[PDB]
């Protein structure tokens, strides 16, 4: 809770709205945690936590039956019948504008970080989308908990995701509690033996399924503790927030 960097009003087009087989819409916090990890490994700067807020979002299409994207022949098994309307294999798309906050541990200077971040953002992606435009990053300094409200308020205006936990399961909680599920981690099922077609022959491979937790959307000025709005990697392949379950 020392150094934060803010990038607000980032326009991304063509975001992959399909996060799982039952969740279509906002990417989960895992996507932003992976983006932060990619920034850390590529840039060489340790990043602690990531916070994301939704300024605008819209899934392409209508209220129901979102959309279908046309496919093309790109495999080496055809050539005779590859002339008319390849099959679908549906994949939804959406368009959104977000705002990001990154917890950074860097004290060498004050202006080099802005340049190094701007260099990475110009060639980065958000859930497969392309970044159209963004504002100039700026750095905020927090020494204690009381001034954390200022760096929190620096993110206006946007809607931040907070964690409320699961009671029984997402299906019953969504109808009763009126919240929306989200993916917070993966559970391993069984180890991959054949390492031929994998993208890496050194990293161990696993079959995993998403684990669901229920979240809520809150205005930035209405957040009690800012530590509840920051996400980071946890134990047993999970993503958790610093402040735990959000309580009013």
């Amino acid at each position: 809770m020392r150094k934060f960097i803010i990038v607000k009003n980032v326009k991304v087009d063509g975001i992959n709205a399909k996060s799982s087989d039952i969740t279509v819409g906002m990417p989960p916090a895992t996507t932003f945690c992976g983006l932060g990890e990619t920034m850390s490994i590529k840039t060489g700067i340790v990043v602690k936590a990531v916070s994301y807020g939704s300024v605008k979002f819209e899934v392409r299409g209508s209220r129901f039956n979102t959309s279908v994207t046309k496919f093309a022949w790109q495999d080496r098994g055809n050539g005779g019948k590859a002339n008319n309307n390849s099959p679908i294999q549906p994949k939804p798309l959406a368009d959104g504008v977000f705002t990001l906050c990154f917890e950074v541990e860097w004290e060498d200077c004050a202006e080099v970080l802005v340049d190094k971040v701007t260099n990475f953002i110009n060639t980065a992606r958000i859930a497969g989308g392309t970044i159209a435009s963004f504002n100039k990053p700026f750095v905020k300094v927090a020494k204690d908990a009381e001034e954390l409200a200022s760096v929190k308020n620096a993110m206006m205006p946007c809607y931040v995701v907070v964690d409320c936990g699961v009671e029984v399961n997402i299906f019953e909680d969504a109808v009763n509690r009126k919240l929306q599920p989200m993916v917070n981690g993966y559970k391993k099922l069984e180890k991959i033996v054949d390492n031929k077609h994998m993208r890496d022959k050194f990293t161990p491979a696993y079959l995993a399924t998403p684990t669901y937790t229920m979240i809520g959307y809150k205005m930035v000025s209405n957040v009690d503790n800012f530590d509840q709005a920051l996400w980071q990697y946890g134990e047993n392949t999970k993503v958790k927030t610093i402040g735990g379950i959000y309580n009013d």
């Binding site: 819209e58 392409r60 209508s62 039956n65 959309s67 022949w73 495999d75 080496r76 590859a82 002339n83």
Partner: protein, 106 residues
């Protein structure tokens, strides 16, 4: 009248729905990108060229150029690495198609 991009959506209260972003007409990025790579002039006939795709085909017209007549992306790709090189047009097509993304397999 202007012509923004359309969408393929399951039957709804409308019969023709146009793409928009918060009430303003816009065009899809795939449609913009398709017109940029319409440079495939390097085949036997059919002036007014088409877009570069593996097994270069135009599903709107129902015809598929670069059919099974020993001029494909995969045939040229296999022949280039297996000794004999290609002509200028073949490399200019293979590189242009590799600039376009995609997964090749089977």
């Amino acid at each position: 009248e202007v012509f923004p991009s359309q969408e393929f959506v399951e039957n709804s209260k409308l019969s023709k729905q146009l793409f928009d972003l918060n009430g303003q007409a816009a065009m899809h990025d795939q449609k913009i990108g398709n017109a940029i790579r319409t440079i495939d002039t390097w085949y036997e006939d059919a002036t007014t060229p088409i877009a570069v795709e593996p097994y270069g085909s135009v599903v709107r017209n129902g015809v598929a150029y670069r059919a099974g007549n020993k001029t494909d992306l995969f045939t040229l790709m296999d022949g280039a690495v297996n000794g004999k090189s290609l002509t200028e047009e073949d490399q200019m097509f293979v590189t242009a198609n590799l600039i376009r993304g995609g997964v090749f397999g089977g």
